[PDB]
Amino acid sequence: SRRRVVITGMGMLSPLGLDVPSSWEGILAGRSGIAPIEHMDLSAYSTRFGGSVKGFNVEEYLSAKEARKLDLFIQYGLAASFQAVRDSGLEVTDANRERIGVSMGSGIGGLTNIENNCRSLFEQGPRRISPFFVPGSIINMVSGFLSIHLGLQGPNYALTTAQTTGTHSIGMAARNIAYGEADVMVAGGSEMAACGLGLGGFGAARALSTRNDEPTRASRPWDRDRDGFVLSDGSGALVLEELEHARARGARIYAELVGFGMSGDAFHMTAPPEDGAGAARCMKNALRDAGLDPRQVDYINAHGTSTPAGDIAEIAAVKSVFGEHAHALSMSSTKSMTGHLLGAAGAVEAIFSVLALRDQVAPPTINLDNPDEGCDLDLVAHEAKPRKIDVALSNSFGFGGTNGTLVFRRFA
Amino acid sequence: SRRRVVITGMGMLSPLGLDVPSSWEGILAGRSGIAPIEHMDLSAYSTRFGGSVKGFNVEEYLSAKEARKLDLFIQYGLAASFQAVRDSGLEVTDANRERIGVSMGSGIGGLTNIENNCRSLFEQGPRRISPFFVPGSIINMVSGFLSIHLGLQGPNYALTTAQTTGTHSIGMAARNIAYGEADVMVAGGSEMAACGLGLGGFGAARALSTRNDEPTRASRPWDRDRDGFVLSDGSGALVLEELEHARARGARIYAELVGFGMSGDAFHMTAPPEDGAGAARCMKNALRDAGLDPRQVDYINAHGTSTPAGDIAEIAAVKSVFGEHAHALSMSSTKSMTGHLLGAAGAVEAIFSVLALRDQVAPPTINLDNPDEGCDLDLVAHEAKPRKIDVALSNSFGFGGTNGTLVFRRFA
Numbered sequence A, B: 001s002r003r004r005v006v007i008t009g010m011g012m013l014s015p016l017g018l019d020v021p022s023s024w025e026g027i028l029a030g031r032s033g034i035a036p037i038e039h040m041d042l043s044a045y046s047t048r049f050g051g052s053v054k055g056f057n058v059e060e061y062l063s064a065k066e067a068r069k070l071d072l073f074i075q076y077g078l079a080a081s082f083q084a085v086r087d088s089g090l091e092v093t094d095a096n097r098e099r100i101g102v103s104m105g106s107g108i109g110g111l112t113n114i115e116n117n118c119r120s121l122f123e124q125g126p127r128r129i130s131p132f133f134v135p136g137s138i139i140n141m142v143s144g145f146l147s148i149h150l151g152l153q154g155p156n157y158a159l160t161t162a163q164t165t166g167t168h169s170i171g172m173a174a175r176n177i178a179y180g181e182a183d184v185m186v187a188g189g190s191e192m193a194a195c196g197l198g199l200g201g202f203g204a205a206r207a208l209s210t211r212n213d214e215p216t217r218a219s220r221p222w223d224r225d226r227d228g229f230v231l232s233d234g235s236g237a238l239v240l241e242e243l244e245h246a247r248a249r250g251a252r253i254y255a256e257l258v259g260f261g262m263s264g265d266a267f268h269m270t271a272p273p274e275d276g277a278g279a280a281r282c283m284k285n286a287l288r289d290a291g292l293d294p295r296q297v298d299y300i301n302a303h304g305t306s307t308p309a310g311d312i313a314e315i316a317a318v319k320s321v322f323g324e325h326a327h328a329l330s331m332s333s334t335k336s337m338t339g340h341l342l343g344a345a346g347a348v349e350a351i352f353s354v355l356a357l358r359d360q361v362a363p364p365t366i367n368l369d370n371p372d373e374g375c376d377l378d379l380v381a382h383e384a385k386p387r388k389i390d391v392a393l394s395n396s397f398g399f400g401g402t403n404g405t406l407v408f409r410r411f412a
């Protein structure tokens, strides 16, 4: 019968910091992590900025020997995973290693590695492709390498649901524990898509903000002057744990994961429907899964990408689901500060939602100077809002019309 | 308590054929789909052959214009998915569309598109990158395009667990139905990694057979002269359906899916442990999930990749799990004929396991001329073996030590 799932450990690399506390301090202070990109010449590109991880030292985690084999998205996912496991206090033993698994996802995986090996193939020939190209680039190898380093023998998999990945990874990992397939899961996502192929590919779709002359103001969810998402890098990982397992070992519990929803839009390969129908179906699944009155929802960490169509679809969905209570909850987009970490977005945002519960504060939507037509909810414009938060919802939406919602609440 | 899951529809593209019955006819005849790769200069590569899909006509499924937006691996996944849904007879309605979902995965996704967009980027710069590059290449777009085309609003996701993808996709879709999150799922995988990057990437790791002179003899699982796997393309899709739902509409039921196991080796990035301890845990987990004793197993569709270490690990795993019954079951690698479809391997081999149940026949391991040291099980060398099959397993063991096992049973 379905068991309860709690969060005992969290870990992160973001554009705001090299761990959770440093990232969260930036979130509550309204700081932007967005800056012109330094790692490549982007003069031929329409977008030349994004949310980079600043000062990442892989030798805090891995030998230089091993680090050289791995795409940055794997390095970031392992860094977040190691933080989360250490934060949990969990000791892996022969008695429990079969009951601990990992579901760390990515939207794109090792794009830097692919580009670099494609350059070798075209300029030199196939004999110059790295022997480590496949195991060092493909998406499941955060789950794989973490399992090898910590001896995790439980369910070992990876989701790839584009901008929904982190949310789906956490929800499905919670189902593994709920249904008895595991007692512990490390789950979340990681992404490093900031190479020519990534900025070029999103650029070709005209999906990205082109505010190159003022990057900290580019990401402006629900602002009438928004012009697309800001591409960002990093990782979130959480340790999910069966409740009685956590209680038995005296774990610190941050919050309980009470609900998870998925739905497909079945609308369009890339565009969300303007009315938010799929996001509404997804949230209602998640609230019913959590056994909640929708009026119990205090805080929503929106997907809030700063696209014209996405941001308005989310208002329409929240109004449809919550009716008059839509005017009582607080909803914010931390992408205003972090940008869009794509497959890691739902992972860092799940962590921000849990910290909103721990600290009783709604993070701000920075840059919300002129709310667009119909964007008239409490969007926590400019400044963090201390408030009562018993229930927090984290939403994600992605290419293929794929929707995820996580529902967290305080644990006593 | 759990609902029962049955298979009511199957679809496939393989190196043996453009549908299930053509592919299966090849399998029971011991035919190879392996040949030198055409319309591609592989002079500089150590492997010049593999399993290509021959004469695929995407315009049976899509307009030319919609096909130009999608990587081959997406085309192949959609072809198998549309076949599977047709074969099921299912009518999607407003009354059931929220209960029908998709989980079609890939190990590598859009390598051909990545390669062609790299070419444009390096030669001409980012302004020649296709606008459809990202949504036409990312792994969740089979689930996405299928949901949009058929109006599916149920769980929409994609797994990427390397060579385990197709098995995990089917197993986790089965869990969705068993635990009441959906009534119908389309599940499986697709792969098209025959470009410079795929042949070059696996080749750089010296993971591929280099038997260029005799491509049909390259894939020789458990044979003492095997020298690595053969890279193959295609797709498999199954319609999974809650039993009472299948019976109420008079569906043709092929078989029941009674068990799913997952484990992690936690051993090595690309090699299994010599004793297959992870594969043994995974099969034991799958049989426990099915409430079956190892002695009830009749037929195993092996992972059987034709790698030195992989093939011997599976023999050790089977001897460990099945003890005095290990010689009584039949175990065959259809990869002897199809080669290794990576993320689609588990999907086409689940279909072959179901068909082994329908037709009471163990498919051959072709090329098993000189069984290696300790390869003394019934490996169905050279020719198909009619036999009693009530319970069939299908195993997948991939990079990162990620394992999957499906248990299928005759339905009456």
Ligand SMILES: COc1ccc(NCc2ccc(F)cc2)cc1
Binding pocket: A107, A108, A109, A110, A111, A114, A133, A134, A137, A138, A139, A201, B107, B108, B109, B110, B111, B114, B133, B134, B137, B138, B139
């Ligand atoms: C935007 O284009 C894409 C980028 C990545 C992927 N898949 C993951 C992946 C494939 C091959 C690798 F070597 C490493 C990762 C597909 C499409």
